[PDB]
């Protein structure tokens, strides 16, 4: 009520923006079979250029 409160504003227009794939910023400690997902994400992000 009476202190700092984190904002909830986000990117709500770019497609598949929050389908974050593995990189050095995520340390590759995810589910093993998510590599396929990464490929899909990659392909999707090449479709919207």
């Amino acid at each position: 009520l009476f202190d700092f409160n984190p904002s909830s504003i986000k990117f709500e227009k770019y497609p598949f923006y929050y389908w974050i794939n593995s990189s050095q910023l995520t340390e590759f400690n995810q589910y093993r079979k998510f590599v396929i997902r990464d490929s899909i994400i990659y392909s999707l992000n090449n479709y919207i250029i």
Binding site: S22, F28, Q30, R32, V35, I36, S39
Partner: protein, 128 residues
């Protein structure tokens, strides 16, 4: 290998057939699977050489420990680092386009093992 009795011939046939499961099932491929460029044989040998080099360092320490708990703890501590590196390698090899990319990723993984893996293992073993 021709000259043998019926029982020996049957045993040899059994031993041969138990090793051709990879041969029989290579024809049955799936269309919808996500294919990847596999790690080449030379890179496989280099990675196994790096693993053997790691095992060279840990051998006296683990063989001079009389408690299974300590050896299991040593195994677990190294395995987390190795699993992070393995995840990086698996991602970068699955997302590979040509054999050059797969070789690059395998070389990066082997270099990580031979550069940082040995240092981390040595620190752990000194702790033990």
């Amino acid at each position: 290998v021709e000259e043998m009795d019926t029982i020996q011939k049957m045993n040899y046939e059994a031993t041969v057939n138990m090793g051709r499961q990879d041969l029989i099932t290579r024809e049955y491929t799936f269309y919808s699977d996500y294919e990847f460029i596999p790690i080449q044989e030379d890179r496989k040998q280099q990675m196994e050489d790096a693993l053997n080099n790691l095992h060279k360092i840990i051998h006296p320490t683990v063989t001079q420990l009389k408690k299974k708990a300590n050896v299991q703890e040593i195994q677990d501590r190294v395995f987390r680092k190795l699993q992070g590196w393995e995840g990086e390698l698996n991602t970068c090899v699955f997302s590979a386009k040509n054999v050059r990319d797969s070789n690059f990723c395998a070389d990066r993984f082997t270099n990580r093992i031979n550069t940082e893996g040995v240092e981390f293992v040595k620190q752990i073993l000194r702790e033990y």
